[PDB]
Structures are given as C-alpha cells and as structure tokens.
Write a protein that binds this ligand. Sequence first.
Ligand code: D8S
Ligand code: CL
Ligand code: MN
Ligand code: ZN
Ligand code: ZN
Length: 453
Amino acid sequence: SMFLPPPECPVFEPSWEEFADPFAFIHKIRPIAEQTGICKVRPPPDWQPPFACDVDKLHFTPRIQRLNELEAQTRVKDYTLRTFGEMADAFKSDYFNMPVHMVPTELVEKEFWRLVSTIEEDVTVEYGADIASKEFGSGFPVRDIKLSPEEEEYLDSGWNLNNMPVMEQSVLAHITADICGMKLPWLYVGMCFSSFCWHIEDHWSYSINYLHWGEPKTWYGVPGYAAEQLENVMKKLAPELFVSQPDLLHQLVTIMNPNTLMTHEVPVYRTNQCAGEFVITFPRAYHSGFNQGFNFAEAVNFCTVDWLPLGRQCVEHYRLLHRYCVFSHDEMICKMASKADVLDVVVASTVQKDMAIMIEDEKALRETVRKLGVIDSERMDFELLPDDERQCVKCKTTCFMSAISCSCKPGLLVCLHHVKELCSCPPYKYKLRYRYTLDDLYPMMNALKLRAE
Ligand SMILES: O=C(O)c1cc2ccc3ccccc3c2s1
Ligand SMILES: [Cl-]
Ligand SMILES: [Mn+2]
Ligand SMILES: [Zn+2]
Ligand SMILES: [Zn+2]
C-alpha cells in the first residue's frame, strides 16, 4: 500500500576458482546483471581482508544533508571516526526509541520513504565522502609500516579496490592525464538515512563498492537500457534538475521513490548489501540508496573492454547535452595504440576496432570542414594543453584529434562539429589544428593488429 519494495537484484556466490579473476567473473555474469543494472557478489567464505584502524586518529569533515524527495542536491562539494560513530548510534537509537540491532531493515526502508515525502518533517543527517588521503586512507591493505602475513595475502588481490584500476584487462589504466576522481578509491562513512541520490557514473563507467563493516546499505538500480525512460520521468516531475550547468562541480541530483518509477514502467531492482559483500553497477545503470546505520564503505570506477564502445557513445551524448568531459576518450585510445607492444592481446584487439571507427569518423569530419573553406592547417599537441584550454566554445567537448582556431579570437577553439560557432570572420581566416595526419594513424592501428595477431 504505502511502499512496495522492488524485486531483488541477482546475487552471485563465486567459487574460489571463479573469484580469482574479477574481470573474467564480471564478463561471465554480464548477460544477467546488465538486465538489472546492479548485482551483489558474495566472496568465498574464507576471503576476509583484515580491517584495522585507530578510530581516534582518523578525522574528516562531514557533509550535511536534508531529506526531501525531488529537492535538488549537488553531487560533490570536524569529526573523528569515534565521535561520528557516537553521534550516529545515538541518532538512530533516539529516532526509534530502540537498540539499533533490533530495528528491522524493512522498517527503516518503509520509514525512509515516509519521511522524505513528508513536507512537515525536517530531518537532517550527516556523512563522509572523500578520496583516500593521508588523513584518511584505504580500508584495504597497501604497501608502505610493516605488514602482517595476513595483510600481505590481500595486497595483490584483484578485489583489493586499489589494484582494480591498474590490472591488465582494465582500460583506464595507461591513462596518463590525471583523473584523480576516477582512478582512486573513494571512502564513505554512513549513518541511518544518509543517502546517495539517483545518478550514473562519469563516462558511463562501471563501479564496484565494498562494505568493510557496519550496518547494511540499501540499494536501488535500473538497467542501462532504461536510462532514458528514467530521465524522461524525472524531467517531468523535477525540470529544475535539467537546466544547463557551468561545470562538473555543479551537477544536480535528487531523491526519488522507486515506486514512482515502477508506476511509469521503468524496471527497478533492490538489495541490502551487508558487511563483507560487493555491489557492482554496470554502464549507464542508474542507482541510488541509503544507509541503515553507522557503516564504512569503499568504492572505485573502472572500465573493461566491453565498455569501450559505450565510452565513445557517452562522449557523443555529452556533446549533444553540452556536458563537460572528465577526459578525452580519443586521447586514451591513441595512448594505448602508442603502447601496442605491451598491451594484453584481447585489449589490443578491442582497441583496434574502436580506433577504426575513430579514424573513419575523423576522415569524414575533415572532408566536411575543407568544403566549408577552411584551408590552412597546422599540427598541434593537444595533450599538452590544460583541459580548460581545449574545450569547444559551443559544446564543451575536450578536443584531441582536431579543432578550429582563428587569430581573431586568441586561445579559443571549436570542435569540427561547430565550425560556424567560433567567430564572425570568413572561414579562410581559420586554421585546422590536428594531432595526427591520416597517414600517421594507419600505422598506429597496424601495430595493434600485429599485437592482436
Ligand atoms: O537468463 C537468466 O537465466 C536470468 C535472467 C534474469 C533477469 C532478471 C533477474 C533478476 C533477479 C534475479 C535473477 C534474474 C535473472 S536470471
Ligand atoms: Cl521531509
Ligand atoms: Mn555511483
Ligand atoms: Zn563542439
Ligand atoms: Zn575570427
């Protein structure tokens, strides 16, 4: 009547043999899990990474959160772990007039959706979210301090979320252009009702979340194929979230009842993630949720070979929306081509196919701007420019393969889709700036082909 819980998402329990290689495992479950957007992974019973920390020496600055459905929040923006924990336990204890382990999960869920929909309730909560640093580090073992033999067992686990971004079957690895918010783990300190709004990952990447300890985290997920249905439902009910934003640090997001989505025929799934379990989200899969109580989680983005074509589609979609990029997809592709001899052979093969499309599109774009009367040209090392100095004036895309400039407007650039948007001068005053000639590009793709055999 009031809240009807969505159906449960898939839960996998891999054997030690299946578990050994995360990328092989993720590829295996993909046909099931991409139908639901999120899934849960329970490691083998004896896989237990040790967790240890001083609750008095870890400090962090908390964010404050109002809990109202459809109200705008911004995506990104002092306690010790002990003092936060004391605040969190007392809050839950007093809210329900109960001891915390006796508060049923079904009840916290029901109550969460009651309180966010009710205008006359003004519940505020706090939480932590930050990338690993010296003041607050990874929950997984890392190399530095002498480690116990148990900790060194987990140092090079593929499921140690520090290693995940730099494994061989991973794609975001050899990226030199720093993208700190996308290759490093984030740490999250939760309390009862603190929540994460509906969103998808930057560049439509995968994400993987590990709950180290504490009370469960409740998740809702939507499969990738339904991303645009969800957005249309959201646009109708809260248009303010969809106005154009001046940068990446101004993304607007919101809390919204999954029953609202289910009423509009958007498929939604749920899960309670407990301590010691993994949740994985797939490309373009919308997700949100809330914490049941005091807890500690760690998460990281990643990109497999399966993702490469979607990554190209994502940047195209960013262009239509005038959304800023975190990195240049074409720059990453060419960086990998330049390292073709050390690439894994399946990677080399998949990169080669994306490069072939890149080259065909670039050929056609250069033919088009030549016919507009752009004649002069000069080579340019785009990867050396800071990102804010190579975004298209019109669509904000990060340039790499090519761009148009004019001496009339020093420093400004447009991508080749927006030649008409640079300035009022005739096109013979423009220059085509390019990273590679077509003749440079075909040998790069050939090296990939040889490596792939
Ligand atoms: O091809 C198959 O055998 C399966 C398809 C689905 C679809 C949604 C699902 C949602 C929750 C749990 C399992 C599924 C499965 S299993
Ligand atoms: Cl409220
Ligand atoms: Mn996420
Ligand atoms: Zn553009
Ligand atoms: Zn001009």
